Design an enzyme around this catalytic site. Structure first.
Site, short mmCIF file in Angstrom:
data_model
loop_
_atom_site.label_atom_id
_atom_site.label_comp_id
_atom_site.label_asym_id
_atom_site.label_seq_id
_atom_site.Cartn_x
_atom_site.Cartn_y
_atom_site.Cartn_z
N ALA A 156 8.36 19.00 -3.16
CA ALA A 156 7.04 18.97 -3.79
C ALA A 156 5.92 19.21 -2.78
O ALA A 156 5.07 20.08 -2.98
CB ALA A 156 6.83 17.63 -4.49
N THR A 187 14.03 21.00 -11.12
CA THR A 187 12.97 22.02 -11.41
C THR A 187 13.54 23.26 -12.10
O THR A 187 14.70 23.63 -11.87
CB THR A 187 12.25 22.46 -10.11
#
Ligand SMILES: [Mg+2]
Ligand SMILES: [Mg+2]
Ligand SMILES: [Mg+2]
Ligand SMILES: [Mg+2]
Lengths: 204, 240, 231, 212, 233, 222, 244, 4, 235, 195
Positions: free
Chosen positions: D49, D1
């Site tokens: 997530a 990310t």
């Protein structure tokens, strides 16, 4: 990470002729780092004296706890607690925390106001009472103190002589221990007067 | 635990315990709140059957909830301490989670919610207390004055009074307080508050307490001499 | 009199007045009729309104694909009991992969209502229920009373003026029981039964409420224009 | 990310990538890492997530309840602290979250709060969060000025994600751009790295390490 | 968290045209010690279901008691307990499957592998597996432990898919089961010669056979085998 | 030490069209190197035109499907028989999955159906509840084999218009139910060839406005 | 059920009074009078024992005056057993404060907490209130010498001089008459005894029917001493003021 | 592990 | 005394029946449902002229698509509103959608009978819950402390309820516009109110699909009051 | 969190606290104020585990502020330090202890004396003329032993403090991005903006 040897320190108590002595070093450190040279380990509740070695947070916590308890004792009993009684109170309180103990090596010292008998006692961290005629030792230089006390001590010492013996026991023991020293205090306790002396010792 | 439903409905649709809690408020010493253009003033009666009092240490009628909000009351004194404590805790809790002090409305809404909860909880009786909550919201200069009561209802007032003979002092404020033009200054607001208490009190000596609250946590309590000057001034103008 | 202060007190003649007062709430409630054949079971319910501006109180509740009831009395109590039935039907399905027997459904309701009549603080349920269902032993109709008494019947009716419909079904017993493999005719018999409990008012389109369950028919409720057929 | 958000003359720029990974397996290239809490509040997502997605949508519900109860939009400080106090209760349980609560209110102005799963809460002008945060920092810091235009700021935020998307193996997919003003947040489109890289390489003359 | 102490080995089973067959040996092993020899690991529930259990025997005896209690509970306030509202194999299985999964979810499993074999009220064959993890599956042939590795291959040569079930008779099916039990006796070190076999048929009902023995065994060729390589004598 | 998890293998696949959606999954169930069943369905009709599969550890998969099916049932009771929309189902499943955040359902969940505009919808979940709507998703043991093939064939990734110098991409377009089923069948035959836990049978559930249809195809049994 | 036998101790009258608190106050009005007087250099606590018997052991007895800590004491009026419950709680609260802050508890804080406990029994729990009124006499470095009183309602107020128990109406009039602000301890001692001597229901005020205590700064340099008077010391102070 |  | 959850001989709960008497003492609240929206209006009824009337909050937002008016012991409504708001937001969190007005009302009504010897007494307040959803459109519900709720085309609660309800019976028809409904609430409020109706002692609100739930400003209501008086004098 | 120092001089207490907040291989912030005002004349700096530090500091702040409102009175630095120690002493034997080390600098208005208390996460309290937490002490203590005098002014204290910061900037491995210095005296708490 051994709670009994993080902060360091020592306490020693002796009996004499119609008197008792209790002494302690002043060091408080964090392992190798010396932090404070004013950290006294001896407290008193009325005429009963309590020395505490070990983990410093617990030393402070127990002092506050026994002050708490002896104050309520006095209000209800309408008299000051005696050394024999206080010793049982210390033992009770420590064993109450049997499976989560205070990491301390307490030492009671005092003269019974009724009988006039000199009294000293020691405990392990979970409250096992160690009564003794001669002397009690505690702290990171206990081995050194045991050796010094066993050789130097003799019964029925006068207050002025007892002072020299207990002081020399503490000083020479403290000098062979890295985590003890940095100053020292000695209490000489007679039936109705108590003298407190700060010793000169090597500051390393 | 003690479970009994003490506050319950009667045939005519009244909750007598809540209404009897109002009677306790009616017995309590008079309290008055008047808000001006840039300030709020909380006046409080102190009964003069109690001499040999120690005014240094005796609990004051007006209590600070935070540095910017105050709470006065009428009714049972012991009951008021519980509400004040809860309010003070909530004030600090609000600063901790919201990173901003309470508004006067929020604090009032909380205190009123506590009072209401005691009107339909088992084992408890309603608070025998009505409060006047006054102050200024953070970074705001508009004066706020709220009232609560045992039932749990609360509302905002331009000026209001509670306690014994409160109907007399409310009568006074209703004709003397102008909505279009409130007390422009601190002096005018305090004077109107003192005047209103002088309709009921008896003597203007150590019977009247005055507390002035101003914006940005500016709260101060007036002394005897300071209050006595207003009493002296009002009586001289009265003789006309 | 002195023995109706709570459910935990017996009268000198051995009566439970709080339970009887709960029973009284059912008599004030709007009429509802239950009846069955061997293939299907039918509920018919006269819904009640506050006034012409209000809706009509829904009387029928679904409990599973094969079971449901109609209510008469305190509607919130029916919601509590119907929710309990839904959970018990659902427990039977998840744990045992088994459709809950209508008879067990009744036993479970009986025991739940009973606990509220023997303990201090609580109160009896203030509602009567008519439970219909189709399980492994065919069609069923139960009558639940908040005293705890549950009764399996061919047909019955509860609520205000329910005696008129109950007398009719007692006469019609031999006819409607043999309406097998014909839903619309069984409903007609139920609609004619509930009509014997009407006074001044008649069955309109948003007044009547019908439900049915059977062999190849899941529990389904009919309201609004779907019941216009039977008027 | 890779996620960033910085404060500047014209408000706040927020930029994120859209890659999701399970080890070395690229699970998705089209993940929404910006949560739209309300017209004036945004939240960025990095770390686990589920943890981010679940607790930030929950945060949005708590912010909605605030404005119902208080008849007023929640402050950026208050909103971030609800989240930071929540994750702090779970401290040691193994939540993995690196978030940024970005928004505008009257009393605060444009504000950015970094909040992570070990309880850290920091107000600041510039933050980069994620596995490719250092790559984004390198480009962002060396080109950042307070006096950037809305056009230049949007590009820098986009270019910083692209830099990270390129070098960091666990970042990529596409860039999502947001601009937060006094009037609220404004979405500035989804930009696929597949086309964006070559477009930037050609027009800017950068990325000379790559075989053109 | 458990560890199994006294254990039972393979349970094997298969479907045939009119019903199901299930078998399991009568051994209760204590590690490598073949401790108990009279252990019944097939437990009938009613006249239409047989539950075969492998794994920990103490947990097996617990499950017996649950099934025994389930029959009692079902009979309460149930006039049709021996008819329409009798316990089905599917009811019994789902109950066990629920318990097994609940127990694993509490990290305290019943250390077993279970095969519920039976015939439903409508005549359908029921055969389904559940184990300590709460994992469930169904198949024309099911087997636990070594049975899974050695019996299934043999039983699948008879019924390889659904369409082979109507073609398989009870004689052929039982023969395969008995043959599988022999192979397991040759090759499973924690198996015994003595076993039980149960047939649940939709016509003839529940037939429970006890004290069966593995027979027609090939051992003669062993005499010719000498040494481990070179040795001629 | 007791290990509460297990791997039951198998693989699943969801594709969304314009006015339909498919959710396919092989019927093989395994543990280690043994086959448990050659036909054990793991794609289920949950009602309200929602099809669901929770592949991985079958016990947790069955438990999750069972709980969602029950969630649909109570949604009808509590909200006047309202139809549960696919987006509402997805959010509901997130809460089911995240409910066990600290003792997860070891499953890759996929649901399929139609959105509220009548268009095909596929939602995919990780084991702890993170979800996303997609046109395309493979899940389970052979996901790594199937997914890149789907990227190439469904979403036309890495495919450029011939003669445009790799400048113009191949345009996206909805696939027909016939073309989708071809891709599903080829995906599963390929996965069967190169993955040992995939085979035996293929079961596809197709969802249109008319309802839920099924199709079954044999797969290699080795 | 048990509802039938519930007195409902925590409810309002139609007039807005708490029945049980009012009746507890009625109880306390029959208790031996206790007086507290605060001087500039100390505090006096005087209390009348309830109709003494000649065979009562007077020297080793404690009915009215109790010690909470070194700096704070209380005079009791009402049920002695109730008071002792509250006194042990107060003693513990003072030690909790000392343990927490390493400082002796401020008088008002101790008084508030003890009064808050009493309040609780009037608002919840369904139990009878404590039939006790206290006079708190204490010192701290913030407000110096302080007198308080609390009653079963849980309401407390501060005083310069105050009486509780029997004949408080008559006693408060006499205190209000002769009290002044620049008063000394020795003068307050005389006022306390004179007031009891006039308000007493007994024929004559004697040493065996009194408890007495002072809180002075009469110790050596900037420290407070509590003096609970012995029987002989009360006999002497009673002669010294010319009452006997 | 988890999905980042 | 007697039990809290006791039945009368007629078959009614004493405490529920007595709470209804408290609601009759409350200030008037009127709701009218149309195809263009639902209108909610209340009598503020300030006990004194010094009380700042804008602080009287008897109309309340539950969600963007659901509003609420109250009458009776209004302090009791606070926890009911709190529950309603939480239920509405919680449902949005679990299902990514707006919650049905009926389902919301049912959730509120479930609290009602959760009293006994749970809370110590029933609520002393009635609620008019107005809202919109995609399925059943614009709706108005009347939630009582009995745990019962009826859907209404129009409904009045409070002290002037029986008189206002009889007026609503005649005036309401299925083709009412939003503007017509607004005036009708003001008209009927002015009839049953003790003091003379104006923008300070009466409050209007509405809920529309497009703009959601909105409480009207005192400036907006004042123009509707002026428009109302002119139309009545016009014939 | 890393460097926190404290120096008690004649008429004030001076607290210096590093500005760096580092997570991994990134300095996320370089202007962090690692202190809270507990009361007008009492300031607490802190250092330790991420999250715990601020959560603990603010919890203490709220409690002291609550006390101030209730009694309309400011607690002495000795009283506040004892309260803080007890909280840490409780904490160490909790399920999850606060891993926070603090310095409490305060001016006692009754005694007219500055006071510096050093409390570690175990609940180990000591009053000192100068204090430090973490690796800072290993350099600063020996330096202060040499250069410190008890009768120093606030300006002399700041120069002594500069000498510590310079030594730390020379010999410390990590970049701590300088310090925020705050002075506590009879007139309350104020920040030195140019250091
Ligand atoms: Mg040494
Ligand atoms: Mg050294
Ligand atoms: Mg194979
Ligand atoms: Mg330390």
């Amino acid at each position: 990470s051994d709670p009994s040897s993080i902060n360091g320190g020592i306490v020693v108590a002796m009996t004499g002729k119609d008197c008792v002595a209790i002494a302690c070093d002043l060091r408080l450190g964090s392992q190798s780092l010396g932090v404070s040279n004013k950290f006294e380990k001896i407290f008193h509740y009325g005429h009963v004296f309590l020395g505490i070695t070990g983990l410093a947070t617990d030393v402070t916590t127990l002092n506050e706890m026994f002050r708490y308890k002896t104050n309520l004792y006095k209000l209800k009993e309408e008299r000051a607690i005696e050394p024999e009684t206080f010793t049982q109170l210390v033992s009770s309180s420590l064993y109450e925390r049997r499976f989560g103990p205070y990491f301390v090596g307490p030492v009671v010292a005092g003269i019974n106001s009724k009988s006039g008998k000199p009294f000293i006692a020691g405990f392990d961290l979970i409250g096992c009472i160690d009564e003794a005629k001669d002397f009690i030792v505690s702290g990171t230089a206990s081995d050194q103190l045991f050796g010094m006390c066993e050789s130097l001590y003799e019964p029925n010492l006068e207050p002025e002589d007892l002072f020299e013996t207990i002081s020399q026991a503490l000083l020479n023991a403290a000098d062979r221990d890295a985590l003890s020293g940095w100053g020292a205090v000695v209490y000489i306790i007679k039936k109705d007067e108590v003298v407190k002396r700060y010793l000169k010792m090597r500051q390393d | 635990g003690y479970d009994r439903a003490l506050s319950i409905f009667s045939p005519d649709g009244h909750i007598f315990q809540v209404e009897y809690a109002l009677e306790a408020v009616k017995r309590g010493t008079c309290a008055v709140g008047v808000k001006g253009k840039n300030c709020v003033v909380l006046g409080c009666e102190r009964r003069s059957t109690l001499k040999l009092q120690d005014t240094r240490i005796t609990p004051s009628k007006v209590s600070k909830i935070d540095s910017h909000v105050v709470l006065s009351f009428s009714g049972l004194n012991a009951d008021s301490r519980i509400l004040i404590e809860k309010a003070r805790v909530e004030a600090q809790s609000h600063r901790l989670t919201l990173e901003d002090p309470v508004t006067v409305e929020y604090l009032t809404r909380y205190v009123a919610g506590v009072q209401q909860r005691y009107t339909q909880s088992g084992g408890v009786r309603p608070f025998g207390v009505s409060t006047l909550i006054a102050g200024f919201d953070p970074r705001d200069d508009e004066p706020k004055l709220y009232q609560t009561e045992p039932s749990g209802i609360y509302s905002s007032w331009s000026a209001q009074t509670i306690g014994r003979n409160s109907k007399t002092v409310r009568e006074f404020l209703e004709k003397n307080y102008d909505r279009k033009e409130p007390p422009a200054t601190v002096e005018e607001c305090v004077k109107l508050t003192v005047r209103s208490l002088l309709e009921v009190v008896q003597t203007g000596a150590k019977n009247i307490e005055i507390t002035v609250v101003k914006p940005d946590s500016d709260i101060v309590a007036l002394s005897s001499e300071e209050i006595n000057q207003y009493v002296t001034q009002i009586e001289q103008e009265k003789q006309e | 009199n002195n023995y109706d202060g709570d459910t935990v007190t017996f009268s000198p003649t051995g009566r439970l007045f709080q339970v009887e007062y709960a029973l009284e709430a059912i008599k004030q409630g709007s009429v509802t009729v239950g009846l069955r054949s061997n293939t299907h079971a039918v509920l018919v319910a006269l819904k009640r309104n506050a006034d012409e501006l209000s809706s009509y109180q829904k009387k029928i509740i679904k409990c599973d694909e094969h079971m449901g009831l109609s209510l008469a009395g305190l509607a919130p109590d029916a919601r509590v009991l119907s929710n309990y039935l839904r959970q018990q039907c659902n427990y039977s399905s998840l744990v045992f992969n088994r459709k809950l027997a209508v008879e067990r459904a009744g036993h479970l309701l009986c025991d739940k209502a009973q606990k509220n009549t023997q303990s201090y603080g609580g109160r009896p349920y203030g509602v009567g229920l008519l439970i219909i269902g189709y399980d492994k032993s065919g069609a069923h109709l139960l009558e639940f009373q908040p005293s705890g008494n549950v009764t399996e019947l061919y047909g019955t009716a509860i609520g205000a003026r329910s005696q008129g419909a109950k007398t009719y079904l007692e006469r019609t017993l031999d006819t409607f029981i043999k309406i097998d493999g014909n839903p619309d005719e069984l409903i007609k018999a139920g609609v004619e039964a509930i009509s014997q409990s009407l006074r001044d008012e008649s069955l309109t389109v948003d007044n009547l409420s019908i439900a049915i369950v059977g062999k190849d028919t899941p529990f389904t409720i009919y309201d609004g224009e779907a019941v216009a057929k039977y008027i | 990310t890779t996620t960033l958000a910085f404060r500047f003359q014209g408000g706040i720029i927020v930029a994120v990538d859209s890659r999701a990974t399970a080890g070395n397996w690229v699970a998705s290239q089209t993940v929404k890492k910006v949560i739209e809490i309300n017209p004036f509040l945004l939240g960025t997502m990095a770390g686990c997530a589920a943890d981010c997605q679940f607790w930030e949508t929950w945060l949005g519900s708590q912010c909605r309840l605030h404005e119902l109860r208080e008849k007023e939009r929640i402050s950026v400080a208050a909103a971030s602290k609800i989240l930071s106090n929540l994750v702090y209760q779970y401290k040691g349980a193994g939540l993995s979250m690196g978030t940024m609560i970005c928004g505008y209110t009257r009393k605060e102005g444009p504000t950015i709060y970094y909040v992570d799963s070990d309880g850290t809460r920091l107000k600041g002008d510039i933050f980069c969060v994620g596995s490719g945060q250092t790559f984004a920092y390198g480009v962002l810091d060396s080109n950042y000025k307070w006096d950037l235009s809305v056009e230049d700021a949007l590009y820098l935020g986009k270019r910083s994600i692209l830099a990270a998307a390129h070098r960091d193996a666990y970042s990529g997919g596409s860039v999502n751009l947001y601009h937060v003003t006094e009037d609220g947040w404004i979405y500035h489109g989804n930009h696929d790295v597949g086309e964006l890289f070559w477009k930037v390489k050609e027009e800017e003359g950068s990325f000379n390490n790559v075989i053109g | 968290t458990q560890q199994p102490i006294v254990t039972g080995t393979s349970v094997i089973s298969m479907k045939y045209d009119n019903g199901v067959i299930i078998a399991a040996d009568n051994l209760g092993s204590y590690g490598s010690l073949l401790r108990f020899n009279g252990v019944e690991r097939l437990i009938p529930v009613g006249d239409n279901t047989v539950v075969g259990i492998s794994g920990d025997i103490s947990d097996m005896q617990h499950i017996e008691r649950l099934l025994k209690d389930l029959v009692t509970e079902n009979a309460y306030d149930n006039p049709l307990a021996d008819a329409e509202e009798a316990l089905e194999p599917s009811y019994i299985f789902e109950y066990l499957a629920t318990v097994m999964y609940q127990r694993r979810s509490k990290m305290n499993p019943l250390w077993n592998a279970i095969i519920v074999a039976g015939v439903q009220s409508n005549g359908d064959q029921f055969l389904r597996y559940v184990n300590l993890l709460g994992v469930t599956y169904s198949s024309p042939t099911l087997a636990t432990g070594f049975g899974a590795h050695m019996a299934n291959p043999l039983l699948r040569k008879v019924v390889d898919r659904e369409s082979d079930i109507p073609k398989t008779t009870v004689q052929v099916a039982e023969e395969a089961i008995v043959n599988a039990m022999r192979v397991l006796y040759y090759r499973d070190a924690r198996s015994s010669r003595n076993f039980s076999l149960a047939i649940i048929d939709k016509n003839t009902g529940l037939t429970f056979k006890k004290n069966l023995q593995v027979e027609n065994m090939k051992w003669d060729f062993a005499k010719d085998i000498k040494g481990y390589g070179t040795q001629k004598i | 030490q007791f290990n509460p998890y297990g791997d039951n293998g198998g693989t699943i696949l969801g594709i969304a069209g314009e006015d339909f959606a498919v959710l396919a999954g092989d019927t093989r169930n395994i543990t280690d190197y043994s086959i448990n069943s050659r036909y054990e369905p793991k794609v289920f009709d949950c009602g309200d035109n929602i099809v669901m599969s929770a592949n991985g550890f079958a016990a947790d998969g069955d438990a999750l499907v069972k709980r969602f099916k029950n969630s649909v049932k109570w949604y009808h009771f509590d909200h006047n028989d309202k139809k549960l929309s696919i987006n509402s189902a997805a959010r509901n499943i997130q809460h089911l999955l995240y409910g066990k955040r600290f003792f997860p359902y070891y499953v890759h969940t996929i649901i399929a159906g139609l959105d509220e505009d009548g268009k095909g919808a596929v939602y995919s979940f990780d084991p702890v509840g993170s979800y996303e709507r997609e046109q395309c998703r493979a899940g389970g043991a052979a996901a790594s084999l199937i997914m890149p093939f789907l990227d190439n064939q469904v979403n036309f990734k890495n495919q450029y218009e011939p003669g445009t110098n790799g400048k113009v991409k191949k345009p996206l377009k909805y696939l027909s139910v016939e073309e989708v089923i071809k891709l599903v069948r080829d995906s599963f035959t390929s996965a069967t060839e190169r993955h040992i836990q995939v085979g035996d049978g293929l079961e596809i559930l197709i969802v249109t406005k008319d309802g839920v249809r099924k199709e079954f195809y044999e797969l290699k049994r080795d | 059920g048990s509802r039938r036998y519930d007195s409902r101790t925590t409810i309002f009258s139609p007039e807005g009074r708490l029945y049980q608190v009012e009746y507890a106050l009625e109880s306390i009005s029959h208790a031996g009078t206790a007086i507290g007087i605060m001087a500039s250099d100390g505090i006096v606590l005087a209390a009348e024992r309830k109709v003494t018997s000649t065979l009562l052991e007077q020297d080793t007895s404690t009915e009215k005056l109790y010690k909470l800590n070194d700096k704070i004491a209380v005079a009791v009026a009402g049920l002695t057993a109730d008071a002792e419950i509250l006194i042990n709680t107060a003693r513990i609260h003072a030690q909790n404060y000392l343990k927490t802050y390493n400082e002796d508890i401020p008088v008002e804080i101790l008084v508030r907490r003890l009064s808050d406990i009493k309040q609780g029994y009037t608002q919840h729990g369904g139990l009878r209130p404590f039939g006790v009124s206290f006079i708190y006499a204490g010192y701290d470095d913030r407000y110096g010498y302080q007198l308080y009183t609390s009653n079963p309602s849980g309401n407390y107020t501060g005083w310069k001089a105050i009486s509780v128990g029997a004949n408080t109406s008559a006693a408060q009039t006499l205190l209000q008459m002769d009290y002044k602000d620049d008063m000394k301890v020795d003068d307050a001692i005389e006022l306390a005894l004179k007031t009891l001597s006039k308000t007493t229901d007994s024929s004559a005020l004697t040493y065996d029917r009194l408890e007495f205590a002072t809180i002075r700064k009469g110790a050596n340099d900037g420290e407070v001493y509590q003096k609970i008077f012995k029987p002989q010391e009360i006999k002497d102070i009673l002669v010294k003021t010319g009452i006997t | 592990x988890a999905l980042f | 005394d007697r039990g809290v959850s006791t039945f009368s001989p007629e078959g009614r709960l004493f405490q529920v029946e007595y709470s209804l008497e408290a609601i009759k003492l409350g200030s008037t609240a009127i709701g009218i449902a149309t195809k263009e929206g639902v209108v909610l209006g209340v009598e503020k009824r300030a006990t004194s002229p010094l009380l700042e009337s804008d602080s009287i909050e008897k109309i309340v937002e539950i969600d963007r698509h659901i509003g609420c008016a109250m009458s009776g012991l209004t302090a009791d409504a606070r926890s009911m509103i709190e529950h309603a708001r939480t239920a509405a937001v919680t449902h949005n969190l679990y299902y990514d959608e707006d919650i049905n007005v009926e389902s919301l009302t049912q959730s509120v009504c479930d609290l009602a009978l959760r009293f006994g010897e749970l809370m110590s007494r029933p609520f002393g307040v009635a609620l008019l819950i107005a809202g919109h959803d995609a399925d059943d459109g614009y709706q108005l519900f009347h939630a009582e402390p009995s745990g019962t709720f009826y859907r209404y085309n129009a409904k009045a609660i409070g002290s002037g309820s029986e008189g206002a309800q009889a007026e609503l019976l005649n005036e309401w028809h299925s083709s009412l516009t939003l503007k017509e409904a607004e005036l009708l609430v003001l008209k009927i409020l002015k009839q049953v109110m003790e003091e003379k109706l104006d923008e300070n002692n009466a409050q209007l609100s509405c809920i529309t699909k497009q703009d959601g739930f909105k409480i009207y400003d005192n400036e907006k209501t004042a123009e509707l009051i002026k428009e109302l008086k002119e139309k009545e004098a016009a014939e | 969190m890393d460097i926190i120092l404290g120096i008690r001089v004649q008429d004030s207490v001076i607290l210096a606290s590093s500005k760096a907040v580092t997570r991994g291989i990134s300095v996320l912030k370089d202007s962090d104020d690692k202190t809270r005002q507990l009361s007008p004349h009492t300031l607490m700096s802190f250092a330790g585990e991420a999250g715990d530090t601020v959560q603990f500091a603010e919890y203490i702040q709220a409690n002291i502020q609550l006390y101030s409102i209730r009694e309309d009175y400011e607690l002495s630095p000795q009283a506040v330090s004892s309260f803080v120690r007890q909280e840490l002493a409780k904490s160490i034997r909790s399920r999850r202890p606060y891993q926070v080390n603090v310095l409490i600098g305060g001016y006692d208005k009754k005694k007219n004396k500055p006071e510096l208390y050093q409390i570690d996460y175990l609940g180990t309290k000591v009053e000192l003329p100068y204090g430090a937490h973490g690796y800072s002490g290993f350099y600063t203590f020996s330096l202060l032993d040499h250069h410190y005098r008890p009768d120093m002014t606030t300006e002399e204290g700041l120069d002594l403090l500069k000498l510590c910061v310079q030594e730390l900037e020379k010999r410390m491995p990590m970049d701590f991005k300088g310090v925020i210095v705050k002075i506590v005296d009879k007139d309350g708490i104020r920040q030195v903006d140019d250091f």
